[PDB]
Scaffold this active site. Sequence first.
Site, short mmCIF file in Angstrom:
data_model
loop_
_atom_site.label_atom_id
_atom_site.label_comp_id
_atom_site.label_asym_id
_atom_site.label_seq_id
_atom_site.Cartn_x
_atom_site.Cartn_y
_atom_site.Cartn_z
N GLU A 28 0.93 -1.63 0.07
CA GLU A 28 0.18 0.31 -0.22
C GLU A 28 0.74 1.07 0.26
OE1 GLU A 28 -2.81 0.71 2.60
OE2 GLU A 28 -3.31 2.46 2.56
N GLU A 60 -5.21 0.87 -2.61
CA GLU A 60 -4.46 1.68 -2.46
C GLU A 60 -3.00 2.50 -2.69
OE1 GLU A 60 -6.36 2.55 1.83
OE2 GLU A 60 -8.16 4.38 0.68
N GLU A 98 -14.39 -2.80 -0.29
CA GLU A 98 -14.44 -2.09 1.14
C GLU A 98 -16.17 -1.27 0.50
OE1 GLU A 98 -11.17 0.54 3.14
OE2 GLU A 98 -10.11 -0.70 1.87
N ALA A 155 -19.96 0.71 4.01
CA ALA A 155 -20.54 1.24 5.23
C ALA A 155 -19.39 1.01 6.52
CB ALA A 155 -20.83 -0.03 5.54
N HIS A 156 -18.38 2.48 5.82
CA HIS A 156 -17.34 2.68 7.28
C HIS A 156 -18.60 2.41 8.50
CE1 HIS A 156 -14.13 4.87 8.30
NE2 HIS A 156 -13.41 4.62 7.77
C1 LIG Z 1 -10.32 9.68 4.56
C2 LIG Z 1 -10.20 9.59 2.81
C3 LIG Z 1 -9.96 9.91 2.25
S1 LIG Z 1 -9.28 7.60 3.40
C4 LIG Z 1 -10.14 6.11 3.46
O1 LIG Z 1 -9.66 6.59 5.12
C5 LIG Z 1 -10.54 5.59 5.18
C6 LIG Z 1 -10.76 5.70 7.36
O2 LIG Z 1 -10.18 4.83 7.90
C7 LIG Z 1 -10.59 3.87 5.21
O3 LIG Z 1 -8.73 4.02 5.23
C8 LIG Z 1 -10.52 3.84 3.54
O4 LIG Z 1 -9.40 2.44 2.84
C9 LIG Z 1 -9.51 5.05 2.77
O5 LIG Z 1 -10.03 5.46 1.47
NA NA Z 2 -9.50 3.76 9.68
#
Ligand SMILES: CC(C)S[C@@H]1O[C@H](CO)[C@H](O)[C@H](O)[C@H]1O
Ligand code: NA
Lengths: 211, 211
Positions: free
Chosen positions: B24, B69, B145, B147-148
């Site tokens: 990454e 990423e 990825e 549903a954060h």
């Molecule tokens: C904040 C975004 C511009 S990047 C975003 O941050 C997240 C935070 O948990 C995760 O790491 C995701 O994989 C990432 O795409």
């Molecule tokens: Na994170």
Amino acid sequence: PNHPLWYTLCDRYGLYVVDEANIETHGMVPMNRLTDDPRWLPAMSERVTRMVQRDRNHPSVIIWSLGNESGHGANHDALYRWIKSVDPSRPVQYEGGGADTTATDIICPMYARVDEDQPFPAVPKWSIKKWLSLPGETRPLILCEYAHAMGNSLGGFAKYWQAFRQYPRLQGGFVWDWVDQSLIKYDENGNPWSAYGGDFGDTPNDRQFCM
Amino acid sequence: PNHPLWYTLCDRYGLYVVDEANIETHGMVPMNRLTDDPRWLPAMSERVTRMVQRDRNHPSVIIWSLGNESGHGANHDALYRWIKSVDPSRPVQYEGGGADTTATDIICPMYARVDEDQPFPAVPKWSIKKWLSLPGETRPLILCEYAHAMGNSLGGFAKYWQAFRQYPRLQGGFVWDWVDQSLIKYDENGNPWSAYGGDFGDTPNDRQFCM
Ligand SMILES: CC(C)S[C@@H]1O[C@H](CO)[C@H](O)[C@H](O)[C@H]1O
Ligand code: NA
Ligand code: NA
Ligand code: NA
Ligand code: NA
């Protein structure tokens, strides 16, 4: 096929035309009873071939249609290929037999909804958004009929147009339809009134469904 | 790649695993600065080849991932093909450079929404329903990825699952993520508390984004 002047006017004013064969066997059970029968191939072939021979030079005609509501029969496949052979310049479409058969270059359902599936046996009307991405499906989708404008209607019309704009392969459709098929009758005073099915003693009839 | 026991446990309890190379380069500008550079191909190749050589016998491993990423670079294309060549038994996925590049067998976006397009330049996140039917697109879509789940979250989770069930080629996704990365600290009373970014004097930091 329409009165010949219609194509001339569409050429000059600027409208895209789907030119459609004079074949509809809606009342057959099942719908493809005649169109899958080789003995009716000659009669159907004439309705297709003579339409192409008449109208092939019109620029307004951009798509050929094999007719309407006649299920899907082997006679459709034969005539689909005939057109593709004599005139490679225009796509062929046909809705019968589930709107996405081997006799159509365009997925052309009638009254398929935007988001809601209607999974009828054999001939489901998928959500148009969903239809595009069915496994293996690559074709454009243009509704041959949608937004049935009967009386106080066209609720949810904006929902079609939002989808048409967001989805590249949703390329629109043809509203059903332009003009009410009402006929004028006169009462005792000689005053005109708009008449529909049944008003001529015609029976059986389908009442206001012509409007 | 995980602690080797993880794959044994997934074999035996039954979980499908996406095994992902330890690559990454998120903080590069642009994101593909190293992955497009042939000088970094050797270091990158080892992280992919040595993962495949270790893990190729686990049944739980059903998909290979090229990392995360790191934009899309020519090194991804080389290593994608290397895997397809040595192990035809498993699809290869990679999200970088727009989620649908030549380096992925699976459209695997992160945080693409159900109905709403997010048309970022170069790397748009299309609505997942729309993404599937883009002109010429045939691949399955599985969100790497979505549903954060940061704090009070998973709003609209039902909306993803309605779409997953309706659309055959929407074959689900991987929630972000399983477990809060909080660490334990101790105060004066010796009582443990949950700590996030910055709580160790670490700076710069991204605070509670680890949870
Ligand atoms: C904040 C975004 C511009 S990047 C975003 O941050 C997240 C935070 O948990 C995760 O790491 C995701 O994989 C990432 O795409
Ligand atoms: Na994170
Ligand atoms: Na469109
Ligand atoms: Na009617
Ligand atoms: Na699905």
